[PDB]
């Protein structure tokens, strides 16, 4: 399974970072559409697991935070821990 979906391309930033180009909707995304996984409510994930689309970033200057590439959000709290906390 190498090919991208029809009417997609992939390209690279000057920093060598891959991203994906969707000509169907005239948008770009960091997410590889070939790698999409089933959505899961955050509270239903295991302790050391993140839902699909999330990335943990450890910034030397700004510390740890979480990035949601589906909704394009960033937050300090681990989203799985947050969901469990608010529902607990």
């Amino acid at each position: 399974s190498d090919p991208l979906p029809d009417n997609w391309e992939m390209a690279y930033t000057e920093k060598g970072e891959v991203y994906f180009i969707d000509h169907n909707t005239k948008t770009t995304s960091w997410l590889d559409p070939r790698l999409a996984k089933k959505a899961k409510p955050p509270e239903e994930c295991k302790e050391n697991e993140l839902p699909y689309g999330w990335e943990k970033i450890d910034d030397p200057i700004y510390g740890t935070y979480y990035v949601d590439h589906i909704n394009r959000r960033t937050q300090f709290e681990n989203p799985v821990l947050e969901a469990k906390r608010k529902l607990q």
């Binding site: 390209a11 930033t13 970072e17 991203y19 994906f20 180009i21 969707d22 005239k26 948008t27 770009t28 995304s29 960091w30 970033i57 910034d59 700004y62 935070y65 979480y66 990035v67 394009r72 959000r73 960033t74 937050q75 300090f76």
Partner: peptide, 13 residues
């Protein structure tokens, strides 16, 4: 206070 903002990929060309 907030974390670094979302950094988007290059815009669609």
């Amino acid at each position: 206070d907030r974390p670094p903002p979302y950094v988007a990929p290059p815009s669609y060309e």
